[PDB]
Amino acid sequence: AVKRSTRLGCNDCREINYLTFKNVKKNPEKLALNKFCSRCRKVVVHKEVK
Amino acid sequence: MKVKSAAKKRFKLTKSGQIKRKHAYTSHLAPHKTTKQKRHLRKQGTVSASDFKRIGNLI
Amino acid sequence: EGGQTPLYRRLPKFGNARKGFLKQEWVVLNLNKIAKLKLDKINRASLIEKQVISAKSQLPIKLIGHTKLEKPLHFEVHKVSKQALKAVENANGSVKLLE
RNA sequence: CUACCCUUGGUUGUGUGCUGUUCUAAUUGGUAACUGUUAUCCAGUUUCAAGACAGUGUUAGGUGGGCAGUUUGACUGGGGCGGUCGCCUCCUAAAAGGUAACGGAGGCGUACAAAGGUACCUUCAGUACGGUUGGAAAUCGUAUGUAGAGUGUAAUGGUGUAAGGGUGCUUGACUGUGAGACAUACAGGUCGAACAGGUGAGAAAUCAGGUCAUAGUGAUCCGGUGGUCCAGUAUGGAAUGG
RNA sequence: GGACUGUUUAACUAAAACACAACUCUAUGCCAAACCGUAAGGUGAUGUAUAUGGGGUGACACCUGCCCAGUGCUGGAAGGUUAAAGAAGGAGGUUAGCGCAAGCGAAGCUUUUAACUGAAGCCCCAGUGAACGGCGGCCGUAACUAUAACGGUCCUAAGGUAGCGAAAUUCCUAGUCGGGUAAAUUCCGUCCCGCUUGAAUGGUGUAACCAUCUCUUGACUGUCUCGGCUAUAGACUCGGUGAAAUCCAGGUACGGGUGAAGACACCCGUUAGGCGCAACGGGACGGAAAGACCCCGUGAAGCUUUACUGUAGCUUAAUAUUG
RNA sequence: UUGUGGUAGACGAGCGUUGUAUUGGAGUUGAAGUCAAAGCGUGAGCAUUGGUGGAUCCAAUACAAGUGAGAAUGCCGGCA
RNA sequence: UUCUCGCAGUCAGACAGUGGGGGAUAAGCUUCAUUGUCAAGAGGGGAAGAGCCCAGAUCAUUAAAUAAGGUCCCCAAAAUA
RNA sequence: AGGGGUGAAAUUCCAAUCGAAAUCCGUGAUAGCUGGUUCUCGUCGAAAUAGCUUUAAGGCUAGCGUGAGAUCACAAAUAAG
RNA sequence: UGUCAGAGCACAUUAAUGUGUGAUGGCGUGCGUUUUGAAGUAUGAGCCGGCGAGUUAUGAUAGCAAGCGUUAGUUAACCAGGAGAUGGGGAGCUGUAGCGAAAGCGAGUUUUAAAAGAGCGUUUGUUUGUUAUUAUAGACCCGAAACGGGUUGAGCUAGUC
RNA sequence: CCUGAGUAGCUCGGAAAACGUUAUUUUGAGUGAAUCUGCCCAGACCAUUGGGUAAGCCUAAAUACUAAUUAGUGACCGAUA
RNA sequence: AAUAAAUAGUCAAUUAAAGCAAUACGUGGUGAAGUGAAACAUCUCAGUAGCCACAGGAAAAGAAAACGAAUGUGAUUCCGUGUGUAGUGGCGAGCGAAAGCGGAACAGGCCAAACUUAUCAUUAGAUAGGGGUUGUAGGGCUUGCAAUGUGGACUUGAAAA
């Protein structure tokens, strides 16, 4: 099975928030994106976790 | 008679029947599932009328 | 099931935090039901005479039910619901919490 | 100079087993002698031989069909090797849907911060005409061409300013849901108005809860990781459990 | 073919089998190995390496070609790898106390396995094939030549050496050839590219011998040509006695068609007085034998094994014996 | 009015026998059992009579069945 | 022919027609869908025939109209051109 | 003396029988496979299809039949459009 | 292998279109069995007589009836007695509030910031009697090759002394 | 001054415990405390607290059971039982 | 005896069976298989079948270092509730408590220990006497008082029924 999806947690409240599909070859760089956080109840910068 | 120990660990009983069951497929991979499926499988349900004939006789 | 996997081993199992722990029971006094009861100046001594609770037993008492009544009485309970507490205090009844 | 922390050696010493010495003073004997006894069994003494070994008790290892208990799926115009067991696309399938075949045709055990979205701009392939190297074929200018182009891909299709290309901006590729439908024996799988909050794209109305779509995935037991407003066997914690 | 005399499945098969003297290999130094039993103990054996035990080939004569690739065994120790167990050490809890909180945190218990030590053994290196066993291709070239005497190439550890070679082995095949035979898919010797021969899981000659097999030959005969008669015991009759398998019930014909596809019972046409006896048995898909031939059963049983898991036995380390 | 094909199978209503228990009766002036004959029944059954027969039954009601025989290569026994 | 409840039963179907596929538009063959039958329901025609045709049987009739189908005889049942 | 003995070896023999004797018990082992299963009557009265299955002889669910209740015409069919 | 009839014959009864019997006419290929199915050349059954295979103990569910009936019903056990009902006996249970993993809360809970929207709640019954079914008990009757344990056989063969 | 030492216990394998090794209890092997100021236990454990001080023994009573005797009974079977 | 003593040993006297079965129960040791799980290696079966040893009128067990979390009882034993509970389990098959209560049924005592007396050579580490059978701590030592006191779990006779 191919496994290249990645979990996305938070850099402030620090829990896994989402799971996305990002290429580990054409752009394996960090993606500190903006998503909704319920524990913050606002748009927060979520960070990919290996 | 005795109550099935294995069975009773997975079904609750509510008022006026309506045996509450659990939801499976929570084991391995979220990416194999969609957001609606993940947010709906958390809710628990009750066996059907056809299933009820196989649940009432079970206990 | 004729070769099909049994239903219990196809679904997850419950988890009980009260494992190895037996929850303390609570005799609940719902206002709608105890309205049928004619007892006044309620205490554990009177309740056992009416067999609402076993005489050779004592259990903590909880108050329950927002169904308003129309008589002031004396309540000696251990637990109480907020809406039930409001219902029994507005009915001019006196309630003393026991512990 | 009053000293300390590191590299290392010499360096007196106390403890630990490792080999190399004897020794029986453990021990054994299927050495011999004597007594019970007239008893080659046995017991006792002495001697002899090793000997703190072997050996036994336990623990932990390796060889170990020598031995023991079990196993070795189904389908198949009968047995058997063949091929398959899951999922998706076309015909079969007879114009609702759907319908079998060990019938006729192919694939999947995915790809992508763009190939999602937003706002804006833009329109074929092929063919033809004319042009340096340069032609059959490099490309441009124009005409023509109904899209046979292209759509991340297997087939189905649709896709003629689109479902495709270019530019800029974010990653709604939202949180909690959800009336309601689909399909169905269960499990499940499909869509989902609309709501609360928060955003993103665009001034905008509107759109965004992934890709034009359908394959693209394994329940459950058990186990691990983080958090938890959960419990803490009398209590207090903790372990541990949820 | 086997050396032989012999043993063999009681009650199908008496041998090309097995055994067999002999040959070869291997282990065992004594309280021997081995074997049995839990263990004393016992055979071996009250033997003592010319004895016992195993493995294989099985008169006698001549040989046993190559290869240690992999395996098994033996030997070797460096190298890596290796348990239980010991503790170098680390972390955490409860809380005395210190602490404004937060937190730090002595001692007791607490919990955890990591430095290092840890054998035997495995990986590693050699020998052992009369130890398992295995022991090739491509191209050019021989008065064609497919052949293969030969020369180059590739692969392997080596590529069956000798011997034999339609054989108990040869599918083709009834191979060819000569003899045999008027005429012989059998037989005798030969031809050597031999599907899949082959040297102790042995090979060739091999004297004699086989209730051994096969072919030919002199004689020999009712085996046959070609069958028949004599006497009995039956078969037949008489007197006595007298059971069995089978058995839904029957008064139980023919041909065609039909059928669950092979009709005494069906329909159509035919014929047959009834009952017997003697032969002989077409049929009643005759009889006993709930298929046993083949298949299935999430059947059983046994057997083999790098199928799994255990485990006897053997071996190694620790610990008490044990200084 | 529909009506009265039907396996599996569903549903409903009844009958037979024994015993217990209460109310009855008969019976050496013959009970049961058995055989027979020329009855009644939708059927489980009910009779009637003749004689063997030589001392037990039947009728009405509930309760409970070692309760209802066409096969089981059915068990035994008897018989061809 | 809706739902619930109780009890089920069946998956080894076959035949005929239609449209087929495979096999050969060979097979009383297989696979299918559809229309009827037997299974689970007899009867008449069909020479006797489970699946063809007519047809769906409470029972008694020595009553009538008939369906398919038939009318020389077996064997009820017509003749004219 | 029987997961034993014996065996010039053949799976030989071990009381006319033996891939391992017989006897009693666990055990009434198990039998998706065979066989059978004993009074009357009335009414209704299918399926041999689908999915799943260490699964094709089996078993589970559906659909179906039947019985009780309700719905009782908006439901369901039959014709016409 | 008999039916529907029926000549004739001999009779005369549970007196009735009677019985027995049938020269002859029409018609007609057994019973269970399992299969899609057998007159079947598919199997079983010779016949006869008895016998011969869905019970029980407990518990639950469903139906019908009853008692009680909105904190009632009901006793397990135990005791008094005729081997008896009965009485004494409330030990406990069910229904009388559920939600949430639980803490906790509760005519609301949980998800959630939100009772937003959704889940359930927002309330009936108890115990016996009959029948049926299911569950534990071998649990309609019968049929395996099988495994272990406890024992006896070497008198038959074999082996040796 | 004393109150039951190879004792409690710790470890290696165990077993009983509903428990398939988990508090607790027992030991085949190793090891091995304190002296009521102490220990055990309050299902790991730790502190406080609670309770009792193992490491000696005995114990009618309700308890299973009839081989039988005595008297009696059987909604027991009646020679196929 | 070898060995002086000494043991081993030899003989003599006394005492318990040794043995049978109640074809029923108990304990302890030992200890299966088929089977179910649709198969099977966990497990179930089952600590059961079976064997042994000992019996007894029953056996085992029994006085809290018992439990266990309560103003909790204060030997043990048995039934029921607790409940098919919590849990345990290829967390599968399956197994399954325990407190608490209602009852059936009551019996509490006895040795070492501390210290002490006497007798053995008092290397006592030997024997016989008070002591006293514990945690609500006690016993031992000593100084005092009050008493003979019930009880049996208990000996002989006598009487009665």
From Swiss-Prot, chain A:
GO terms for cellular component: cytoplasm; ribonucleoprotein complex; ribosome. Keywords: Ribonucleoprotein, Ribosomal protein. It comes from the Bacteria. The keyword Repeat does not apply. GO terms for biological process: translation. SUPFAM superfamilies: Zn-binding ribosomal proteins. The keyword Transport does not apply. One of its GO terms (molecular function) is structural constituent of ribosome. InterPro entries: Ribosomal_bL33 (IPR001705), Ribosomal_bL33_CS (IPR018264), Ribosomal_bL33_sf (IPR038584), Ribosomal_zn-bd (IPR011332). Belongs to the bacterial ribosomal protein bL33 family. NCBIfam families: PRK00504.1, PRK00595.1, rpmG_bact. This is Large ribosomal subunit protein bL33A. The gene is rpmG1.
Curated annotation (Swiss-Prot), chain B:
It comes from the Bacteria. Residues 1-22, 30-49 are annotated as: Disordered. SUPFAM superfamilies: L35p-like. Keywords: Ribonucleoprotein, Ribosomal protein. One of its GO terms (molecular function) is structural constituent of ribosome. Residues 30-43 have a biased composition (Basic residues). Signal peptide: none annotated. The keyword Ribosomal protein applies. One of its GO terms (biological process) is translation. HAMAP family: Ribosomal_bL35. PANTHER family: 54S RIBOSOMAL PROTEIN BL35M (PTHR33343), LARGE RIBOSOMAL SUBUNIT PROTEIN BL35M (PTHR33343:SF1). Belongs to the bacterial ribosomal protein bL35 family. This is Large ribosomal subunit protein bL35. It comes from Mycoplasma pneumoniae (strain ATCC 29342 / M129 / Subtype 1) (Mycoplasmoides pneumoniae). The gene is rpmI.
From Swiss-Prot, chain C:
Keywords: Ribonucleoprotein, Ribosomal protein, RNA-binding, rRNA-binding. One of its GO terms (molecular function) is rRNA binding. One of its GO terms (biological process) is translation. One of its GO terms (cellular component) is cytosolic large ribosomal subunit. It comes from the Bacteria. Belongs to the universal ribosomal protein uL15 family. Binds to the 23S rRNA. Part of the 50S ribosomal subunit. This is Large ribosomal subunit protein uL15. It comes from Mycoplasma pneumoniae (strain ATCC 29342 / M129 / Subtype 1). The chain holds residues 52 to 150 of 151 of the full protein.
